[PDB]
Design a protein around this nucleic acid. Structure first.
Ligand SMILES: [K+]
Ligand SMILES: [K+]
Ligand SMILES: [K+]
Ligand SMILES: [Mg+2]
Ligand SMILES: [Mg+2]
Ligand SMILES: [Mg+2]
Ligand SMILES: [Mg+2]
Ligand SMILES: [Mg+2]
Ligand SMILES: [Mg+2]
Ligand SMILES: [Mg+2]
Ligand SMILES: [Mg+2]
Ligand SMILES: [Mg+2]
Ligand SMILES: [Mg+2]
Ligand SMILES: [Mg+2]
Ligand SMILES: [Mg+2]
Ligand SMILES: [Mg+2]
Ligand SMILES: [Mg+2]
Ligand SMILES: [Mg+2]
Ligand code: NA
Ligand code: NA
Ligand code: NA
Ligand code: NA
Lengths: 113, 77, 47, 56, 128, 141
RNA sequence: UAUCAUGAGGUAGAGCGACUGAUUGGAUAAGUCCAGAUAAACUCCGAAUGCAUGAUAAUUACCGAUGGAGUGAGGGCAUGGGUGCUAAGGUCCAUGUCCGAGAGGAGAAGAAUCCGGACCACCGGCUAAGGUCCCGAAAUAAUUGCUAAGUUGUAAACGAAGUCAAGAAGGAUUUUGGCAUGGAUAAUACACGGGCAUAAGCAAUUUACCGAAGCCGUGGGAUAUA
RNA sequence: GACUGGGGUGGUCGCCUCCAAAAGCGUAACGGAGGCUUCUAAAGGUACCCUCAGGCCGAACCGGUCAGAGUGU
RNA sequence: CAGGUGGUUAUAACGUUGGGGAUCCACCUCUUCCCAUCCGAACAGAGAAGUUAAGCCCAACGGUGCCGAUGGUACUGCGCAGUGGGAGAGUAGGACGCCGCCGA
């Protein structure tokens, strides 16, 4: 059982309940062994409204603070695009750790959810 | 001699009640079924006995997806 | 061994009627249920 | 654009839907003639009762 | 190893047309394979003698009146269940390339030989 | 007597035989055979009598295939029994056949011996029959 | 009712190396492989019809509420089935239809097979099914074949092939078609309804004609809509 | 007491499922087959996380090919 | 040069052969804290020691799956196979996906 399929099953389970529209877009997160990527998606159109990542962003050496910086950045980008309400998508990851910091920072920013 | 048979239960009147293309009001029953012969889709709810009903008002749509899975949805407005 | 069970201790009074297997659950069943008289959740116990 | 349809055989022992098709065409007696604009619905009626009628 | 056959063109299709064709003692036949669309035609029960025959007579040269001339082999034959009469013949057109697999009669370890017309890959026939 | 070793259901509804046989109408496994021209229920006793005839002929040479198998149970009521009160007593198995179905096949004997043996077998069957030979057969040798 | 548009099917058929039962040969107890094959309670498939909704078209009585009922022993035929023995003028369902509650015509005579739904009168005409030698209305009409058995004009396995065609292999052999022939059979006296007919039989084609209470014509009423 | 291919004897009488049922629903027989007269304080709710059964290799464990298992009845 | 996330019912899947790597993904290194299982295998965290070996992506391959004509046949509506509807299997063949948005 590859970790890819293990996460694909959980992704299907999460999408079974969570879907994004122009209002309340889906906030999906990709982790990888380094960096972290955040995307704001309107699912009925299949079109991304906002995005943020840590590829060109570096402030500390620890992924938790880097994820917090990404969360602040995506909150800023969403509020500039005119987004106030979202629904979080785990994207097959347990809601704990770097993704938890990202979501908490996005809460400290805008994105009332 | 005698026969050991002769029993049968009442028929349950299952099946599709509102076909694709028809207009359905909210709360109308679309399908009576045992299990999910047809799965609920957009604006369609499923009850305890797997009865499919409309959550809005619109036109009933039957669609087929992967593994020939049948979905019943409601297109509104 | 399955029988009617009455939950009580309301405030008239608040009652709930359920079932249980007495051999499986010899001890008295006690659950928190909504109390219509007090409009809050109170502990009901089998009489 | 118009056809004349004459009933040439009896409707006795014919199915009720064929009898109702004769009624919808307007044929209620033998050798009666009706004139209709040859629309697809009229032609489908004539096809349904073709063994009872004649196009004159 | 070369049969000759000629075909009357066929343009009517269906149970009615096939019945009309067969009433006057002829067989509907189709030819397909390779490039180009298929050819529908009519042959005669007397004209077919490669069917009631011991050997696998490859290289049926067909001249269709409405079409050109082709070299094919027998691909499928339909028989009537009760009368055992021939009701339909389908021919596969063999080309220079694209080898065609067929059945070749066996004598005692022998064969009839398929090198020309068809390329190779002969399976067997009456392998008892 | 041919009959299934085990069966899921003891009784069967008496169905209907409709048209021509679209399978088993062509000589496979053999060179000569006999096809039915009627629709009937063939019993195991008839099949065994016909096979005994075709095997007593041909001497010990050749091979014989029987291509139908009786797997339809039938019942009979019995004398003095009125209509109703369920199914009667089981009375064996039958094979339902329609015209075109090949019943018997032979291989390994000359044309005349095959024709005579299949005639003998066909005379013990309850259906009129047609004798057939494979179309690529060579009349000599 | 028809047409068009849209939708869900699991029947007929088919298939099973898609499953579950049954299963036949093999090439190598077990398994693989090849091949052949089966099913109301098998399905990898899957029609024709039917059904639901909407819009057009043609065409007449479809729903609300109220007053009065009768019926709740059905039957035959065709089709799809169960049961029975793929028996019954048998029995149990389904879909139509007719008798019931329906007269008239043909079939010799027959509840529901074939034609056809009777307001009354007529010493008028055209037709249906079916017929045109006499009983008995209308062709001893026209043309071309077949039958020799009065077959006909209203049962089989299995023989011989009597005759006429259409062929195939090589005067003989063999195959496919039409019509006859044997198999063919109980008790008051028999049958094409009868006479009788070699066509006045069978197959085909044509033209006239006969033929009902059907249709039209003439006179006379009645019941509803406009 | 009734049903009942006369009546009696025998069997049956309410509910559930399949087939008979003719691809919507419905549809009979003393037609063909089986069940029920309960159970679970978790076998209910929710968040999260898992995946049976079978064949082979090695010696309950390892390995990789694979809807058959379960869902109290 | 690979990443993320979607639509289209595998013509899209599986597989075999071959090739990648400054970063992108991944394998990989260690369990102090968050967290987890008899087991840091999975889950979770810490930042860069080495690898394209495997995942992943690309290319060729018609191999296993998948799709699939035309013609014919089965079946079937019209109370006659006269007039309409028309499979399944099989055979020709096809197919190693096609369309979006974001980031580099
Ligand atoms: K009745
Ligand atoms: K008579
Ligand atoms: K076809
Ligand atoms: Mg039921
Ligand atoms: Mg069938
Ligand atoms: Mg009564
Ligand atoms: Mg009654
Ligand atoms: Mg009766
Ligand atoms: Mg009466
Ligand atoms: Mg009547
Ligand atoms: Mg006249
Ligand atoms: Mg006269
Ligand atoms: Mg007479
Ligand atoms: Mg009159
Ligand atoms: Mg009684
Ligand atoms: Mg039904
Ligand atoms: Mg039906
Ligand atoms: Mg097909
Ligand atoms: Na019943
Ligand atoms: Na006589
Ligand atoms: Na297929
Ligand atoms: Na096919």
């Amino acid at each position: 059982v590859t970790k890819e399929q293990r996460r694909q099953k959980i992704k299907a389970r999460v999408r079974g309940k969570i879907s994004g529209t122009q209002e309340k877009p889906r906030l999906t997160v990709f982790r990888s062994n380094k960096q972290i990527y955040a995307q704001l998606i309107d699912d009925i159109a299949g079109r991304t409204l906002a995005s943020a990542s840590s590829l060109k962003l570096e402030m500390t050496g620890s992924k938790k603070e880097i994820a917090a910086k990404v969360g602040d950045e995506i909150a800023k980008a969403a509020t500039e695009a005119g987004i106030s309400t979202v629904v979080f998508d785990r994207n097959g990851y347990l809601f704990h750790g770097r993704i938890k910091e990202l979501a908490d920072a996005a809460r400290k920013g805008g994105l009332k959810f | 001699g005698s026969s050991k048979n002769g029993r049968e239960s009442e028929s349950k009147r299952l099946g599709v009640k509102v076909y694709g293309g028809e207009m359905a009001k909210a709360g109308n029953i679309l399908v009576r079924q045992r299990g999910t012969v047809h799965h609920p889709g957009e604006n369609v709810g499923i009850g305890k006995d797997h009865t499919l009903y409309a959550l809005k008002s619109g036109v009933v749509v039957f669609t087929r997806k992967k593994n020939d899975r049948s979905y019943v949805s409601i297109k509104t407005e | 061994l399955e029988c009617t069970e009455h939950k009580e201790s309301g405030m008239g009074i608040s009652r709930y009627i359920t079932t249980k297997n007495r051999k499986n659950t010899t001890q008295r069943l006690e659950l928190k249920k909504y109390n219509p008289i007090l409009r809050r959740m109170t502990l009901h116990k089998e009489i | 654009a118009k056809i004349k349809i004459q009933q040439v055989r009896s409707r006795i022992r014919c199915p009720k839907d064929q009898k109702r098709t004769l009624d919808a065409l307007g044929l209620r007696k033998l050798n009666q003639i009706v004139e209709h604009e040859a629309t697809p619905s009229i032609l489908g009626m004539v096809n349904k009762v073709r063994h009872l009628v004649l196009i004159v | 190893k070369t049969f000759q056959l000629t075909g009357t063109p066929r343009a009517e299709f269906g149970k009615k047309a096939a019945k009309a064709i067969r009433k006057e003692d002829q067989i509907p036949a189709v030819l397909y394979g390779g490039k180009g669309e298929g050819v529908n035609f009519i042959v005669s029960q007397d004209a077919v003698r490669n069917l009631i025959y011991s050997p696998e007579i490859f290289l049926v040269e067909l001249t269709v009146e409405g079409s050109g001339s082709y070299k094919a082999i027998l691909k499928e034959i339909q028989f009537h269940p009760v009368t055992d009469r021939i009701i339909h013949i389908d021919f596969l057109q063999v080309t220079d390339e694209k080898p065609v697999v067929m059945e070749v009669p066996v004598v005692l370890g022998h064969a009839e030989g398929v090198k020309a017309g068809g390329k190779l890959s002969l399976e067997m026939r009456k392998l008892k | 007597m041919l009959q299934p070793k085990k069966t899921k259901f003891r009784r069967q509804q008496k169905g209907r035989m409709k048209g021509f046989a679209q399978r088993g109408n062509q000589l496979s496994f053999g060179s000569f055979g006999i096809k039915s021209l009627q629709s009937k229920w063939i019993t195991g006793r008839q099949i065994e009598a016909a096979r005994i005839a075709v095997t007593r002929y041909m001497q010990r040479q050749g091979q014989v295939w029987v291509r139908i198998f009786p797997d339809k149970p039938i019942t009979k009521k019995g004398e003095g029994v009125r209509m109703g009160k369920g199914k009667g007593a089981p009375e064996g198995f039958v094979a339902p056949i329609t015209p075109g179905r090949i019943i018997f096949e032979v291989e390994g004997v000359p044309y005349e011996i095959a024709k005579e043996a299949l005639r003998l077998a066909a005379q013990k069957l309850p259906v009129t029959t047609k004798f057939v030979v494979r179309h690529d057969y060579d009349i000599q040798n």
